[PDB]
Scaffold this active site. Structure first.
Site, mmCIF file in Angstrom:
data_model
loop_
_atom_site.group_PDB
_atom_site.id
_atom_site.type_symbol
_atom_site.label_atom_id
_atom_site.label_comp_id
_atom_site.label_asym_id
_atom_site.label_seq_id
_atom_site.Cartn_x
_atom_site.Cartn_y
_atom_site.Cartn_z
ATOM 1 N N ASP A 1 14.129 4.788 -30.699
ATOM 2 C CA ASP A 1 13.142 5.623 -31.358
ATOM 3 C C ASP A 1 11.991 4.685 -31.713
ATOM 4 O O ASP A 1 12.058 3.483 -31.472
ATOM 5 C CB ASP A 1 13.762 6.246 -32.619
ATOM 6 C CG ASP A 1 12.827 7.221 -33.340
ATOM 7 O OD1 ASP A 1 11.898 7.754 -32.718
ATOM 8 O OD2 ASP A 1 13.027 7.481 -34.546
ATOM 9 N N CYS B 1 14.246 10.356 -29.167
ATOM 10 C CA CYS B 1 13.940 11.644 -29.785
ATOM 11 C C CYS B 1 12.481 12.049 -29.730
ATOM 12 O O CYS B 1 12.060 13.068 -30.311
ATOM 13 C CB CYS B 1 14.371 11.618 -31.213
ATOM 14 S SG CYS B 1 13.577 10.272 -32.021
ATOM 15 N N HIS C 1 17.858 13.695 -39.951
ATOM 16 C CA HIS C 1 17.313 14.675 -38.998
ATOM 17 C C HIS C 1 18.503 15.322 -38.238
ATOM 18 O O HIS C 1 18.696 15.074 -37.038
ATOM 19 C CB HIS C 1 16.409 13.974 -37.996
ATOM 20 C CG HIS C 1 15.539 14.908 -37.220
ATOM 21 N ND1 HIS C 1 14.628 14.466 -36.286
ATOM 22 C CD2 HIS C 1 15.365 16.245 -37.307
ATOM 23 C CE1 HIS C 1 13.919 15.488 -35.842
ATOM 24 N NE2 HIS C 1 14.347 16.581 -36.444
#
Lengths: 313, 313, 313, 313, 313, 313
Positions: free
Chosen positions: F229, F269, F134
């Site tokens: 995350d 994130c 990502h």
């Protein structure tokens, strides 16, 4: 394409096929611009003096609207303001006018006047209609044929009726563009010999042809477009409506038309005298194209102004 | 408000109160824009063909100035260029014109002509004056009343004198807008029965009223606005100035006016024949509103053009 | 320079030398802008109503082109639309017109009409030609002399022929600008005494001079510019062509001219009647300046409109 | 008028009559701008996130077109992308979204969600439809009544059928605007008591009124506008189409309508279930106003976005 | 060229060759503009509602990108938002949508739906794909042939495989444009008889031809372009993959192609099922033109939107 | 700085530190432009096709808003419109799409798909999220650290929890930028060995470091930023919530955090699963930076589009 910057447009026999094509292409372009709504005020502040020695609305509004679209301004001079050779020598009015305006467009009887106007001009002079010729109409006409038919080359366009100014111009242009043109008229009413001679020399070069005849049904055989216009002794009335017996046979009607191609186009430069040269059945038949043809007067003239005034130097 | 895009304006009985209000509001807006100096060239490159079958400066300059303000262009076609039904069928001129211009405004005698013009048009047709009606004037008139009086609803507006086209239109609009309208005319000179019938049905819906009378002093009782116009047999002269004896009693003057409200408004669509239908004392009295009323011809027409041409699709 | 915002231009005797200089300087500026191709649409959306009670193309196209260059719009009102004192009092048309347009320019016979027009106007009124005077022409004329000669001051400009409106104006301006002006005319055809009186008082202040005479050859002695115009009983014809015997001696020709300076300028406000007041040899001699003079009608009027309408407040 | 810069639009009971009038006036203005073709891209580069927890085309396209007209951009978040309380706490999505977009418009079932969304927002939140209310519809509705009827004040607007979200909003706004509102519903299906209480306090101040009833024919007596909407147990089908027997009497049809004023307006917020709550004869009768009403969803929402986002600081 | 302002595009049999040429020329123009980097945001603020009753990316992105290039905005309505005849009568959604957007483009199964949509529309309706026809594809296809081959006239384009919507449209356009078209399909899978009849009448006029066959190798003889598309019982799978035995012979492959001209063009409207109707060797052979053909979907549709929305009035 | 014109953004290991710095600087610039209200529509008419094979609002709205700010247009292709390898080979959709749009951004499961998409593309391809990496998030993340901390160099950023795609990218970028990065994960859940190898070679050059660990409290010692995350077996639920026992120790909470610097930054994130990987006390502690970090997704992506599409040639 070629520049026409500063040129006059009195008669198309002065133009090459390329010059007449330059104007048709620019015209097609302007027509598309107009259909999609794209502005093109290419002549801001430019002025066009229109001198009308004899009325003509189709010409007056097509030139006036054409200039408005380009952002310029056409001033309309009438017969009550501007006789030509009356209060001052044509040379003098030309001189003064060319100090004020950017181009002149004259609608006059005597072609020699538009010719005199151009000689002392200094500014481009366009002939919107004289007794000898009508160039702006031929451009619109052949533009129309080009749009509809896809080409001008091997198309048999036949004009039936009195050989007049538009007849002259249909001959001069079509024959310059390569069309197979034929004109059929009553015996004493055929186009001027000079333009007939022109039409023949022109034809050699564009592998077209020209052909005078005096029998409509023969003329209209296998025709692509049948064209007609109003007829002789205009203003004749019953007190010399003689044009009736003689011209009557030439009237474009259901029967005459029947000799042309199934997909023939009927053209007329207007005004129509429904009943005389043409009947309701024809001008209104789906084969009629008189209005698209009328409209192209706007696009074609929009191109000559832009071309002869826009190319400034 | 509602769209009027593409509509014709031949007669206001075709319009709803909302449509007539849409135009007055847009007009008020344009009037303010104009007073503060804010540009609004909403119709660049748009053209309006004005056909005048009988002269009329107030209409000619108000439409021509209105289009200039919007950035478009009005072409002026006169009677020396455009008779309607003479050199070509009205259907044909309509067809060709609609290939060049964006809207047509016609000033013609016979209302049936403006009606024929609209039927073959393709482009909006506006009636600047016919013998049956004068819509553009009513819009200006009611706009004026609306400005000055603050509303159109319960206002008694009375028209005195020959029942003509503007009389028709004052009836049709006021009665559609809710005003209490009364028309007083000499015995054989009252508005067309059809519009009188119209006025009554219209009135039911807008809680207004209509009322024909034949006695001015009664009619003008407690009136908010007293309206008049020029009178009958126009062109009569001493050789049938008969209009004098019969109409004379109707002359708007110091005495008649005396029956109206102290704060009444005097209106007249011009031209005035100071001495006949109205006297110097009235048109020039501070109760007179003839000039603001004249001015609103510009704003109101500026709104109908923007509304019927601007709403493009 | 000075503001002329809102002023009228009926006659130059109302103007100071500084005001007339303001217009010539702005005009010179606009002329240069025009020669280099620099736009100057200073009056967008502004409208000028031109009222013509008697035709005049040079004036009509110079005002109409002038307004187009400034981005405004001139509407042309003719005698078939606008008689003045016929269908309505001049005061009334002035009132209504001033509700629509931004300035009025009138070409009328009776100077009192243009004067009445201005009194009820509210909007600047310009006199494009009356029987008493022609200001716009004098401005162009002195502009021309200024360009060519480098100054207006000690230049002897002499006018020969009937003392008319342009004669009046040549006197009023030149004498205000400091020129030594002389007018020579057949015995019963000399300028109005009022303007002659004016010319003399004006002359004292600008160390110029004025001088009436009746002998052309004396008048034209050592002249810098010789000016003439069409002559008397206009419309006279053989049925009172009497102007011939009497005026004939005054005809500007090779011999007369011979008395002027070698580098003299020949001016005429057009139209010329080659053969009468002037001969081919003169108007066409390289001493002739008639066309630059005609052109300056555009620049000079372009300056008065910008000056009297542009200075808005 | 007043600023609404940064405000949320969850329910109109938070708005004063002046604030709701501010939006209607700005909306009328934008509607006129649109009819004359005047651009107004007041929100260039601005973005509006539309969260739809349950589809609705009329709302989706009216908000999306409204933003396009203003030059901004609406992003459409669906139920397949944005459940609210599923993959993250409503507070968190609000926080992140408010870092990207300029305003949020949510169409959600539970009014508490749109309320939670606003509490953590930072950016204006608009309620496009919740189960408690539909503000954007009321604004359009009263805008329509205002246009057609000329005022909102003494107008009797009556809603017939299930008391739902739009019913709530018709009550809250009309009663705030001064209208005499009445709602008639089957016995167990009347508006929430809280909004009914609201409607009554609101009514005192705007000299309007509110009135619950359970008999349609009584309710619709002398009504100016008759309003209806789809009915209960939505998704019911034959397997609980019970709404039929109970609601059926309330169906707006030829007979019911007959009790209203001759010039009554029929309104419905769409979608219509021709056959149920209303019949073909009504929605399509010239008394129907459903489409102008639908259109005003565009103008009204165009005004709230401009007002709450445009007033930036 | 001709105006298409306000027209619908449901099926090309309603179009004349000139109208279809108008769109191809404008498209060529827009393609050149795009290659040289010249902007042409001719539809600022204009909105296009795309209704997709069944997905189609090539159509969705080509219409959406086309509108972005013109400065307008396409809203994408899906099957989860817009079933047609489900929550409201197609007439009603058409009415409301036409109050918000400027044109509608529908991708629907039943051609009668797109037809119903157009009947109640008020705004132009474009058919992006129905079961009867796919006009936008034919325009792109013939545009491609025109670019590559230099003309459409005497070109033998042959379609091989199931006679479906694109087959219909290839027939209708090519035959209208003058091409010699032939369609070869397995015995029970030939184009609708109505369009076959159409193709033959059309062919007479454009000296083209049409010819149904059932033997691919014969059909493809001396062909200029060989065209194919996906085949029958779409969604068939092994549980009715019968299309295999019957259609298999028709598969465009190295051998079949071998009968065509050396410089033949391979076309397919995508999606391709490499292995079925066509093999890797063909779609990827340098004779393949599938991508330029795909690209022209953008240019051709860019022209129809500009033409039918741009020509506003 | 360096050009990235035409580049793809699949994975940052292809980028040099200078290229990644070019994007951060341009991003900082665009962020300032945005805070002061300075427009920057650098990509007018440019289009970005976003292909989402699995939903993601933060990515969808950040890319869509980013393009709106630059004046371009992002089209959103969903899984109901665009499966990749289903109705057509990924190579084919890439080919056609690259004929319509200017750049492609894909959110796909299998990184090999985004890789295949790029290979046949012709137009830049950006990876908005794959299972391997990502990139857009790392750029935002390091941008944030750079803003807050003043540098990226000697900063110890530690990631705790499952080694996934964002973990990969945090390693690749930080280690390329010179940061001392450490990743701590439960024993069987550490980053792919290939990227771990990458991280170590990268680290040598930027005097940073990388370090895998399996004990959070050790890892977080003296940390500048602690990042986490969501965790493993996503969609696991109680029926394999095994991630609980194993991952639970790694939960970022008050105690863990206590080992980091007093001025440490907490990053995530999003989406957060308050209760699992992080607790309310942390994400909401003033040490949390999750929203500025979310916002920088807009600025960072705004820079890559401008950089890879703006640099046109």
């Amino acid at each position: 394409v070629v520049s026409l910057a500063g040129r006059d447009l009195l008669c198309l026999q002065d133009y090459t096929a390329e010059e007449i094509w330059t104007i048709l292409e620019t015209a097609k372009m302007f027509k598309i611009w107009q259909k999609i709504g794209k502005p093109h005020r290419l002549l801001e502040g430019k002025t066009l003096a229109m001198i009308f020695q004899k009325p003509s609305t189709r010409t007056r509004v097509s030139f006036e609207v054409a200039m408005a679209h380009l952002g310029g301004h056409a001033l309309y001079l009438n017969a009550q303001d501007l006789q030509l050779r009356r209060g001052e020598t044509i040379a003098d009015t030309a001189r003064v006018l060319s100090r004020y305006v950017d181009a002149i467009m004259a609608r006059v009887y005597d072609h020699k006047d538009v010719e005199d106007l151009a000689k002392y001009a200094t500014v481009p002079v366009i002939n919107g209609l004289s007794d000898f010729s009508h160039p702006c109409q031929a451009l619109a006409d052949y533009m129309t044929i080009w749009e509809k038919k896809g080409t001008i080359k091997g198309v048999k366009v036949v004009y039936v009726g009195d050989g007049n100014n538009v007849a002259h111009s249909l001959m001069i242009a079509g024959t310059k563009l390569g069309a197979d043109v034929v004109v059929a008229t009553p015996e004493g009413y055929e186009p001027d010999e000079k333009v007939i001679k022109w039409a023949e020399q022109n034809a050699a070069e564009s592998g077209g042809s020209f052909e005078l005849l005096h029998d409509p049904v023969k003329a209209v055989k296998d025709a692509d477009v049948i064209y007609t216009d109003v007829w002789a002794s205009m203003g004749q009335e019953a007190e010399a409506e003689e044009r009736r017996k003689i011209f009557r046979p030439f009237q474009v009607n259901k029967d005459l038309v029947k000799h042309a191609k199934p997909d023939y186009m009927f053209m007329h430069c207007l005004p129509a005298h429904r009943g005389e040269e043409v009947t309701d059945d024809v001008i209104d038949s789906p084969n009629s194209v008189v209005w698209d043809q009328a409209e192209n007067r706007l696009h074609a003239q929009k191109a000559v102004l832009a071309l002869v005034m826009g190319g400034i130097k």
